Amino acid sequence: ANGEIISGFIAPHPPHLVYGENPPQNEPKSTGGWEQLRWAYERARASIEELKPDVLLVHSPHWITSVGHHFIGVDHLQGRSVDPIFPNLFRFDYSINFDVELSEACCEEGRKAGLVTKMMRNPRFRPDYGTITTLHMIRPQWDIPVVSISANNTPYYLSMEEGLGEMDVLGKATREAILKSGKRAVLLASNTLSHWHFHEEPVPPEDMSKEHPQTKIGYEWDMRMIELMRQGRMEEVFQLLPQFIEEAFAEVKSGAFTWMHAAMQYPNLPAELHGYGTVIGTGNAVVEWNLVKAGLARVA
Amino acid sequence: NGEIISGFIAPHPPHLVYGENPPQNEPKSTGGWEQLRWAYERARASIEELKPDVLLVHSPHWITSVGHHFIGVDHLQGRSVDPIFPNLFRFDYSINFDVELSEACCEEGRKAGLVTKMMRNPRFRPDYGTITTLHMIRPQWDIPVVSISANNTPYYLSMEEGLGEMDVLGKATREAILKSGKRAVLLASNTLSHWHFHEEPVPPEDMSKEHPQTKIGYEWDMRMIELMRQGRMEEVFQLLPQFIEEAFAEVKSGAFTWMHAAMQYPNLPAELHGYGTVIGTGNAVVEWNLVKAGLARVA
Amino acid sequence: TIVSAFLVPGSPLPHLRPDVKSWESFKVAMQNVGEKLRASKPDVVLIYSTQWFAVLDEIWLTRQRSLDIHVDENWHEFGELPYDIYSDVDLANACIESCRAAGVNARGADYESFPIDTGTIVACNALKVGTSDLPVVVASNNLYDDQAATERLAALAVACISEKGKRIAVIGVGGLSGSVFTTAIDPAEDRVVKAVEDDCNKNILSLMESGNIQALREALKSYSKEARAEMGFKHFHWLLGALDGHFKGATVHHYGALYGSGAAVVEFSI
Amino acid sequence: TIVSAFLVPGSPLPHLRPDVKSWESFKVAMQNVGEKLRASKPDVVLIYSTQWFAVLDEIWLTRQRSLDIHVDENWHEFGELPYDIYSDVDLANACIESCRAAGVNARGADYESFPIDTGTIVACNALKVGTSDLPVVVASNNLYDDQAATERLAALAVACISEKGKRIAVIGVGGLSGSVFTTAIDPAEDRVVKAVEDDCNKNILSLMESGNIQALREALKSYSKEARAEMGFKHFHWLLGALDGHFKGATVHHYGALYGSGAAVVEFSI
Ligand SMILES: Nc1ccccc1O
Ligand SMILES: Nc1ccccc1O
Ligand SMILES: [Zn+2]
Numbered sequence A: 001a002n003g004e005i006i007s008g009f010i011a012p013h014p015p016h017l018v019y020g021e022n023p024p025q026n027e028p029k030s031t032g033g034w035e036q037l038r039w040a041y042e043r044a045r046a047s048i049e050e051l052k053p054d055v056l057l058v059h060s061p062h063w064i065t066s067v068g069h070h071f072i073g074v075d076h077l078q079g080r081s082v083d084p085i086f087p088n089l090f091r092f093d094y095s096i097n098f099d100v101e102l103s104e105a106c107c108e109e110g111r112k113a114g115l116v117t118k119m120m121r122n123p124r125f126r127p128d129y130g131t132i133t134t135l136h137m138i139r140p141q142w143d144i145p146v147v148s149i150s151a152n153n154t155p156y157y158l159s160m161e162e163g164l165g166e167m168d169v170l171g172k173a174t175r176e177a178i179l180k181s182g183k184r185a186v187l188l189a190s191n192t193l194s195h196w197h198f199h200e201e202p203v204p205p206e207d208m209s210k211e212h213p214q215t216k217i218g219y220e221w222d223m224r225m226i227e228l229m230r231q232g233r234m235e236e237v238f239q240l241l242p243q244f245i246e247e248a249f250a251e252v253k254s255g256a257f258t259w260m261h262a263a264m265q266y267p268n269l270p271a272e273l274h275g276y277g278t279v280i281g282t283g284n285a286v287v288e289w290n291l292v293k294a295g296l297a298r299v300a
Numbered sequence B: 001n002g003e004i005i006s007g008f009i010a011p012h013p014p015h016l017v018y019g020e021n022p023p024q025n026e027p028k029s030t031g032g033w034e035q036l037r038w039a040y041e042r043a044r045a046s047i048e049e050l051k052p053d054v055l056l057v058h059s060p061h062w063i064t065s066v067g068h069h070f071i072g073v074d075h076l077q078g079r080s081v082d083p084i085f086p087n088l089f090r091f092d093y094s095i096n097f098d099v100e101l102s103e104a105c106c107e108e109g110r111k112a113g114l115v116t117k118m119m120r121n122p123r124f125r126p127d128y129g130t131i132t133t134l135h136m137i138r139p140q141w142d143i144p145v146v147s148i149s150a151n152n153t154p155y156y157l158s159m160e161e162g163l164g165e166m167d168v169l170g171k172a173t174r175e176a177i178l179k180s181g182k183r184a185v186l187l188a189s190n191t192l193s194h195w196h197f198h199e200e201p202v203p204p205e206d207m208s209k210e211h212p213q214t215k216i217g218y219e220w221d222m223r224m225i226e227l228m229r230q231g232r233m234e235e236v237f238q239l240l241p242q243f244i245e246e247a248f249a250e251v252k253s254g255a256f257t258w259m260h261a262a263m264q265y266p267n268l269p270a271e272l273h274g275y276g277t278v279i280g281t282g283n284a285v286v287e288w289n290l291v292k293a294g295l296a297r298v299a
Numbered sequence C, D: 001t002i003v004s005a006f007l008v009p010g011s012p013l014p015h016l017r018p019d020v021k022s023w024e025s026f027k028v029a030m031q032n033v034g035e036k037l038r039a040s041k042p043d044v045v046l047i048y049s050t051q052w053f054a055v056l057d058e059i060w061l062t063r064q065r066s067l068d069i070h071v072d073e074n075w076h077e078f079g080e081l082p083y084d085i086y087s088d089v090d091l092a093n094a095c096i097e098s099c100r101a102a103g104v105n106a107r108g109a110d111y112e113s114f115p116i117d118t119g120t121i122v123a124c125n126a127l128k129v130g131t132s133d134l135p136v137v138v139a140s141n142n143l144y145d146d147q148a149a150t151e152r153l154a155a156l157a158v159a160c161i162s163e164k165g166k167r168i169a170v171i172g173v174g175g176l177s178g179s180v181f182t183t184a185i186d187p188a189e190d191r192v193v194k195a196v197e198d199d200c201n202k203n204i205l206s207l208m209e210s211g212n213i214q215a216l217r218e219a220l221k222s223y224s225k226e227a228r229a230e231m232g233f234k235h236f237h238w239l240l241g242a243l244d245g246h247f248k249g250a251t252v253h254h255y256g257a258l259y260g261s262g263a264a265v266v267e268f269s270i
């Protein structure tokens, strides 16, 4: 019972980053694009290399579940993940190894706390495009076991405060399962900030002169929240989340951010911004809460 | 004996100061160009750890016909109003110059065959570009500055011959630094892609309206930055002319060549602190830290 | 030119769990309407499911033959749904060019492993439609397209295919009431959640069998909000658009609950 | 209406170092053209100098009274240039509004410590213009404006100002051949660099003297490139656009060298 969360990250999942990287798992070929955000993730990739995690846990908004919170429970899945909105940019062939023991643990800790939880045991299930993009941008070697958690739709079905409360319980249960696991975990919130976007796509999609924030209000909201995270004023960040989500149409309403902070026990330490960029007008920031550097977690 | 501890590409867009809202600048913004301001936050941190004794800067906004000039006055103070962006830049400056290193820099340039002059007029106004770069690299204004002008040989004579004259100025600048016993930081105050917007956005800090002016400009910027990160500087200088012609880069002024010539053209991997756009022009903050690379001693 | 029109649910519960008799009634009804659909000798089937989202351009399926195996994201514990859907590539591309001319940004979708939605898969499998001799043309659910815009999109796709001399059968895939259970229940206790929606569901179905278009539009100004209809009942608006806003009446083959949702298999008389 | 027109050099060398006989000649000629400019009894002086740059909008000086001191960026070792320039705010703002109506993005410049160029300062001090009884209206040199565009700007300003019933004296501030010396030289050896440049200057000046407008235009096809004229000779297109391409003749009050550049003081017979 010696396990602990070593780092937390806001790992956005825009498929343009993978498109622009032209890795061998992606079928489309690009001439570049979104270089600032790819350099932002290069810094996060270096943190991960020194953190040496035992498991990566992702919460994605592109795996929507109505009956509770699901966890992937098969040892391995392989297939081709084609983004349904950007199939010209993302046609990825994935081969993922999951940590079933720890996913099972998080499911048992969520039922004890009162949430509805299920284990995905189907072996032909296709993991979502967002979970695969966040994982490849954080660790493209695909050599670290994954826990994949679905995004329960209570925030869009009932009230936005009720749904976010369920994400707080989920995070509290994740921490309980991590500590008992004996493993060194890294949480990844696959969420975008401002999600106001372009209604039309630039002819060469990677033409970066057609890339800018969609709204002035969204960029401003994104800059206000990132600065607060860089100063460690997380309490104020969570006081404003409902207004940020409504005024900037934020993708942190899925619950990954609240789940990640609840599992870290809502820390008020300064976050390191790895970088920020727009992807079809949406605001995407790579933010990290390195608890090994804070002294709250042990070094490798 | 002295040595260069770090070399940085340090752009001079007045928008960055405008966005920061320091006490020295009269107009106030509501924000803006945050990704480039965070880039300079990381550069400032290296300057706090490097602890240099003098900052040397080459600026394209101090153009001179007769040779290369060096400010040679004790201190200058007054107000600098940008002629193109006076709604964003009205800075009250107070700068202290390293007179002795400037005189040595002027003496070594004359020895190498360049034409040099010292600026001793106490009512001279230091250029807006030099003031912007210095405030974004060290806003405490507590490090002596050596200000060098940009000789117009690059636009008046040839262009490879003009950059050759900047190579000579950099070698002479290193000769003076080595005999000074000071730890120096060079600041090439240059932009990359310089195709820009012909019109300004009504709220100037409306980042909704900020994007690269051309596709080829950004593409040329990314090619040259990635090359700088890999350490392929020899290939970077072979592509400099084509980059300057095709992307209208502001490295044609000569600070880039001046700085790398004084570092003896290192092929060490550079560190990109960040890249952003300012009315369509490409701006990178990039650092060659000779201390962390074990070729210059620590503080 | 439009020779048949049907509304079928998109839940996979009736095709993955037919041991539950409550859910088995939809499979049979769906199997029955396919026989009636096939009896009208259509040349192509126009499908619009609520589970296939589009966000930028309007998407049209254009893969000649899309052969794969799908596992539902919510009902992954009941099995898988293999499919072999053949599309009319010429007609689908003609619909992409028809939107473009009307100012509607459109593009095709022809990629291997493209995520076809569960609703389109079960409707094609249950109605034995989307085959080599009876292919389909599927339009996506753009989320920024409102009820009125969906009628215009259905109206445009029918005119386009009608002018090529083809006989069209049109299906709208989607449910009725949208409130569903959010906990694991025993399938025999299934019933539509609130009674308001049950009466609302019963009332709107009643107007469809009567052929009262005028009264149907009056009921449609509150039905979507009152019954918490799935996707604002845009899949019925798709059907309306292809019938030019009028049908003589309809035959409800079955109306029931699907995990709290209100579902129905309806057949329209042209 | 236009009442006087002059071309004067923008170098500060005649005013900072008038102990050099060769450079003092331009100073006294410039002092003489101000006397002739005040004899035309103008109500405003319209000035365009090559050293005041604009890169976005066209800038008009709208500061009522601009009182300051300026040290040349190149000739800082010879002294400082103090100035007290009063501008006609109403007329400057009228030109801003007139430009906007012709689709020329324009704005004003009313800021304390704003950087006025060395050329506008020495022209206002030597010709004794820009005072309280004789205000000035200064237009900037947009670098994206060409010769044709510069003539249109002058006509725009001369039309706008003539409608308010003001007599205008117009000045273009700039040199002729632009090849300077790039080394420190004895001022007593100042001469024009290349003889070809020397000859072109004398030729474009003789065409002015005789008012041969047709031959001047022909010469202007090649003068800027052959003489490496300052700023594409745009400041002379400012004068042409203000006179509508016609004048009767000209008086050359002085021609010579200023650190290798060609420079002249020219009064124009309207
Ligand atoms: N899914 C996604 C796609 C593009 C940009 C941002 C996003 O969150
Ligand atoms: N001077 C300047 C101003 C704006 C953008 C880029 C620049 O180099
Ligand atoms: Zn998303």
Ligand SMILES: [Zn+2]
Residues within 6 Å of the ligand: B012, B060, B129, B191, B250
């Ligand atoms: Zn510049």
